[PDB]
Structures are given as C-alpha cells and as structure tokens.
Design an enzyme around this catalytic site. Structure first.
Site, PDB file in Angstrom:
ATOM      1  N   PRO A 130      58.889  74.698  12.876  1.00  0.00           N
ATOM      2  CG  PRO A 130      59.241  73.256  14.622  1.00  0.00           C
ATOM      3  CD  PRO A 130      58.185  74.136  14.039  1.00  0.00           C
ATOM      4  CD  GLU A 131      62.947  76.531   8.652  1.00  0.00           C
ATOM      5  OE1 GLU A 131      63.353  75.501   8.071  1.00  0.00           O
ATOM      6  OE2 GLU A 131      62.031  77.252   8.200  1.00  0.00           O
TER       7      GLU A 131
END
Ligand code: ZN
Length: 252
Positions: free
Chosen positions: A1-2
């Site tokens: 995930p960012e």
DNA sequence: GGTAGACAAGGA
DNA sequence: CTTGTCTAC
C-alpha cells in the site's frame, strides 16, 4: 500500500486495538521479524504490554505500547485485520498478536516481504528502519527549501531523488509520476537542472497530490492513452527502477 | 560518502 | 513477473 492507504489503515486499525493487552504473540514466518533478530525474544517482550497508540511514518506503521514501539512495514502486500481467536486463520497469516479479550491482530502477507522491528519507544526513531527517514510530505518540515537543497547536490533524475526515502517520507511511484506531470517536469530530468520556480511548483504539486489522496489519474498506468490535458499519447519508460509514465508535451 | 541494485517471496 | 528501501559497492 501507498502512504494514503497506510494512513487509512492507521486511522481504522487504531480504535480496533487501542487499550488491548497482549497475552501472546505467534509467529509462523520468523524472517518477518527483523528486531530483535530472535523471534522468540520479539514474542516474549511484547507479552503483557497494552496497545496505547498507532502512528505512521512514511509507509511505516508504528504501534505504540507500554514500553515498546512496533515498527511495521507492509511492503508489497502485508495486511492487518482484527478478528476472534475462535475463528480459523485466513491463509498466509504469518504473525498473530493475541489479546486478553479473545480477539487477535493478524498479519497476513503472501509475499512475506513485510518487516517488523521492536525497540523501546525512545529508541525507535534513532534506529533502523526509521532512523534515516525524511520529513512527512504533508508537514512543514518538507518544504521547497529542503527539496531545493537536495536537488542541487546530485546529478540523478528528479524522479530518483523523490523516490529517496531520506528526501521525503513514503512518496510512492504513482505519486512521483503524477506530481511530476502536474508540475510539468520530466521524470528523467537531472535534479540539479530544475529551476527554483520548478522546485516550488513540484513541491506544491507533491503536497496537493499526496494531500488529495489522503483525503482519477493523469499518467500512471495510462501509457498509450491520450493525455487528459493535451491529448498526446502518454509514454512509459524506465527511470530509477521502475515504470515511469509521462506526457512528452506537458512535461519539460 | 553518495546511490542504486540487491533482496524478500508465492503464483501467473 | 510484481515493490521499497537500506545494505553493498
Ligand atoms: Zn499532455
């Protein structure tokens, strides 16, 4: 995930675990445990501690307990869920923190790329992996001047600079391309070649891009397709990695 | 001392 | 293949 996904995890996980006391830690892929190096010491020290908070640095989650901090990176595809000790574990569950109320914090990761470090709280920020982290992109500490100071010391690509965790915390590939696009700068340009009006524009697009995500893409994954501003086919090459997307007309 | 590649892995 | 960073030159 960012970074924005991690902030969403931070915010939603916290109420689900705060004030819970660890009764057991179970580990099924010990290599995820990076500190202490022995996973049994990692497990043993956690037991009896109550979760007091959850913070984020870059893409790192920092679980705060009584004495210790747990530094967690999801890398490629780690995931946390809270669920009952009575249910069977989902597949690819590598670490489980068991709470005294019969619920569990479960860490799943198919890649097994994620990492965990436990240090005394006071020590966490001056140890691997938080030690060399750059400023939060959305904070005053990350400013045109700080970005300017780094750009003018190096010959490498402005993309390579922005992907450097010491320059700024947790700025992902997708956000580098998008930000450079919005600022009208080519990802392959030498950092030291950027003007001061250019760094100010980049800084300002970096904050907006990451800032909107935290709270519709231009170039990322859109190669072959018309640019949304000028209609020029988006192009995809390799820069500091790594898939790099850009418009040849909008970006200079 | 300044920066990449190295390195972690299970499924197409 | 698919990703993030810090260890290795
Ligand atoms: Zn364009």
């Amino acid at each position: 995930p960012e970074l924005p996904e991690v902030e969403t995890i931070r915010r939603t996980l916290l109420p689900l675990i705060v004030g819970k006391t660890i009764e057991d830690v179970r580990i099924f892929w010990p290599n995820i445990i990076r500190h202490p190096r022995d996973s049994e010491a990692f497990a043993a020290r956690m037991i009896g501690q109550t979760v007091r908070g959850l913070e984020r640095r870059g893409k790192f989650l920092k679980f705060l307990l009584d004495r210790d901090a747990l530094i967690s990176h999801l890398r490629m595809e780690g995931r946390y869920a809270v669920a009952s000790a009575l249910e069977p574990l989902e597949p690819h569950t590598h670490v489980v923190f068991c709470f005294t109320d019969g619920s569990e914090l479960r860490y799943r990761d198919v890649a097994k790329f994620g990492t965990m470090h436990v240090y005394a709280k006071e020590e966490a920020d001056r140890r691997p992996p938080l030690a060399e982290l750059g400023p939060e992109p959305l904070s005053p500490a990350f400013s045109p001047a700080v970005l300017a100071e780094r750009a003018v010391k190096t010959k490498r690509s402005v993309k390579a600079l922005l992907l450097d965790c010491t320059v700024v915390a947790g700025f992902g590939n997708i956000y580098v391309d998008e930000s450079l696009f919005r600022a009208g700068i080519l990802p392959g340009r030498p950092a030291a070649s950027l003007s001061s009006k250019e760094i100010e524009r980049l800084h300002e697009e970096m904050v907006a891009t990451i800032g909107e995500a935290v709270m519709h893409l231009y170039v990322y994954g859109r190669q072959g397709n018309p640019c949304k501003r000028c209609g020029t086919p988006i192009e995809k090459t390799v820069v500091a990695g790594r898939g790099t997307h850009y418009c040849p007309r909008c970006q200079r």
